Structure 1
């Protein structure tokens, strides 16, 4: 019946008439960063067609491509409409759908410049997308080239890791310097360090409050059998450090979307130099400048008693039901009573529910809709937490990117909560 290699074109008028159809799935095959709003071809309006889902053509080489599509609830009985910067970029995706039994597949040729160039055509974007940067933006930054969403004259690219300098020395973005997560958080409490420590640490790494800091980490397949599996979850650590730096007072913090893998996926050169630090004498702002980003245990207890506040438990399901603690250095098992569960992923060192297979952030509409089903909504003051505040920082960053007005991280997490034998806790399947 179908032709695997000749695809029907859908017109702008036809697509306009189908924008509200529940039987139609509009699929943006560009990069997730363009989908979020980055104007990667110089378009005046960035983002995606309103209601479109993100399925980057880059993922076509992934052997799990069909499961990704099914996990996104894109079904063979749906009418599939693909679009990219050009219709030619949609051809391989269209063929891939037809090869897997999707018989209703069309290609929209006029997204750019026709759709982007007229304000009558509805578009959407991740409100604070410029904090989540693509690899091309970082490459222009370190090359001293004109890049959008950047009006500063001072920057530093920071490769985060947890007591694992090999994560940096085995390959890093050229010119980048490494920051151990221990520089900004204490091994005694696994909370952010005191203001005086953060001031010294940031200065010794060459960071002022007015320095644009670009953070990223390297995913190295964490294994629960290792003594420090967090040494392999570099990009969670990067977002954890982004939280602490923004809390401290760094005005412009960016995160490389997808971490190190996005840098090498783009084909850019890597460096193995051990770049020395260029310290700065004065941070230049009071620390912390944004204390409302952090929540501690007394306020967290209040938020459990408030109508417009909630704690969001970003742990794994075995941790939530008290089957495991999730950590080799925590013996207590259980959960904070009254918190809203938002499953992070498989265990304490993986964020499958918040990431794509290439570690870029999951399509934010999916995060937003799943959160809303559990009452995790922006009208509340939300304190994301987990074991020790790493996974909660990554969840918190996703909400911050959506422009949510009062989102925090409860730093202490299950570690601090369970360390007080007076605190109530639950266990078992709810």
Structure 2
């Protein structure tokens, strides 16, 4: 059973921590109802009851230690009753000894904290409701498109996809020889074919978030003003049990006139020499979003990239276990991890919002995901260095760092 309830001020006086047991969408800032409260209590941690069946004892234990919860320091939970009880039970089994309810949680909307642009990382019920013609928070200001992105021709999309979702093949936005973005003229044709003007809202999802992210960032470069991602991609829609549609992509009405000159935001993409110029500075960071084996030089990550090693002077931004995973940015349900947590992860390696920051990996997909998360987090000067390791290392004169090493 729960300890004595605590108000936030009592919690602060007793040096405790608040834990928001709601899904991350609500933690991030999505209101649970129209004009409803937006965000989480100050310095709150997010442990969503919905993640518990995907977190082992080890995983929860690591999470407790990584957030500096002391066994006997008060923790005050909030959210719905059932989610609060589920969290309480696991935390008790993990050995926390002072678990209470935060009795005034969410009662003062003006004191809550949120992702500066949480509305860029959407969630399934929002998108269903949008589709159904309901009023939603942060509604698209005008026309909108929902689009699944994956490599190659539609595969899983044919079996199942989000109702009314188009499909983009990532090969429409990037190509040989270097898996850099196709030309400004080719993006113009791709935008037109997918019914996208600069003032069209685009919501992108993939089986893998980074596929969506990559399309997304390249559309932001071109000039689509309002581009967003389904947070956690397809598996969140699947998990929610919402309706699906099947079969080939339906006809989309083309938009032959984009309505501004492409690229409207060239600064969001950096070339080799721009990337080079960030290195060895405190006011900028060129950031490797590659697995640690990539980063130290054990492997290149890619069957088609012979060289091994890292851009010398690049700072490690974390990423995932191999070249096609992104665990270091995901919660157990595949959604973006807490901004406070990403922020501390990057700060430990001297990566900070006040710097000019550019992310890269082997060819750009993982860097695109981190780009979109930093955008949602309010980071004002971020980009992707497209060519990345494949480009960097294709010239033997570029400097390469190797081996285990710290900040």
Q: TM-score, normalised by structure 1?
A: 0.89
How far apart are the structure 2 equivalents of 1:151 and 1:343? 32
Match status 1:19 vs 2:12: yes
Root mean square deviation of aligned Cα: 1.7
Aligned to 1:8: 3
The 1:111–1:66 alpha-carbon spacing in structure 2 relative to 1, beyond 3 Å, is farther
Q: In the alignment, what sits opposite 1:60?
A: 52
- Aligned partner of 1:190 among 153, 175, 179: 179
Q: Does 1:173 align with 2:162?
A: yes
For the pair 1:409 / 2:401, whether they are aligned, the reply is no
Alignment partners' CA distance in 2, 1:135 and 1:272: 18
CA shift digits 1:105-131 (9 cap, x unpaired): 11124324x233xx3xx3211111111
Distance in 1, matches of 2:346 and 2:14, equals 24
SS of residue in 2 equivalent to 1:49: coil
How far apart in 2 are the matches of 1:367 and 1:384? 14
User: Does the CA contact (< 8 Å) of 2:159 and 2:247 recur in 1?
Assistant: no
Q: Which residue of 2 aligns with 1:324?
A: 299
Give 2:262's aligned residue.
287
1:379 maps to which residue? Answer: 354
Q: What is the CA–CA distance in structure 2 between the aligned matches of 1:359 and 1:202, rounded to whole Å?
A: 28
* 1:313 lines up with 2:288 in the alignment: yes
In the TM superposition, 1:172-251 aligns within 5 A as 172-218=161-207, 234-251=208-225
Question: Unmatched 5+ residue regions in structure 1?
Answer: 1-5, 219-233
Native 8 Å contact 2:330 2:337 kept in 1: yes
- The offset of 1:18, in angstroms, is 2.5
Matched with 1:333 is: 308
* CA pair 170-109 structure 1, distance change in 2 beyond 3 A: farther
Q: 1:71-111, CA deviations, whole angstroms, 9 ceiling, x for partnerless residues?
A: 24245333221111x44541222122223332221112432
User: What is the rounded CA distance, in whole Å, between the counterparts of 1:424 and 1:66 in structure 2?
Assistant: 40
Distance 1:293 1:359 in 2: 25
Pick closer, same or farther for the CA change 1:167–1:187 going to 2, 3 Å. farther
Contact (CA 8 Å) 1:208, 1:280: kept in 2 or not? yes
Q: 1:69 to 1:138 in 2, by over 3 A?
A: farther
Residue 228 of structure 1 corresponds to: none
Is residue 419 of structure 1 aligned with residue 394 of structure 2? yes
> Tell me, what secondary structure is at the counterpart of 1:18?
helix
Partner of residue 129, structure 1: 118
The structure 1 residue matched to 2:41, chosen from 46, 49, 68, is 49
Give the Cα separation in 2 of the matches to 1:20 and 1:326: 49
Question: How far off its partner does 1:164 sit?
Answer: 4.8
Report the 3-state secondary structure (helix = DSSP H, G, I; strand = E; otherwise coil) of the residue aligned with 1:19: helix
User: Aligned partners of 1:65, 1:264: CA distance in 2, in Å?
Assistant: 26
Moved more, 36-45 or 319-328: 36-45
Change (3 A) 1:43 1:111: farther
In the other structure, the counterpart of 1:3 is none
Residue 370 (structure 1) shift: 1.5
Deviations 1:41-83 (A, max 9, x none): 3454310000100111111222526513532424533322111
Indicate the residue corresponding to 1:93 in structure 2. 87
* CA deviation vs aligned residue, 1:337-388 (integer Å, no higher than 9, x gap): 1111122110110001011121100111000012112111111100111111
Equivalents in 2 of 1:65, 1:32: separation in Å?
21
Give the deviation of 1:285 after TM superposition: 1.8
Q: Distance in 2 between matches of 1:102 and 1:115?
A: 27
Could you say if the C-alpha distance between residues 267 and 109 of structure 1 is closer, same or farther in structure 2, counting changes exceeding 3 Å? farther
Q: Which position in structure 2 is the counterpart of 1:115?
A: 108
**TM-score of the aligned structures, taking structure 2 as reference length:** 0.94
**How far 1:17 moved relative to its partner?**
2.9
- Which of 293, 301, 307 is 2:276 aligned to? 301
Residue 105 (str. 1) matches residue 99 (str. 2): yes
Distance 1:63 1:339 in 2: 32
For structure 2, the residue ranges without an aligned partner over 5 or more in a row are none
- Distance in 2, matches of 1:20 and 1:8, equals 16
Cα deviations by residue, 1:276-309 (Å, 9 ceiling, x for unpaired): 2312222222111111100110111111154422
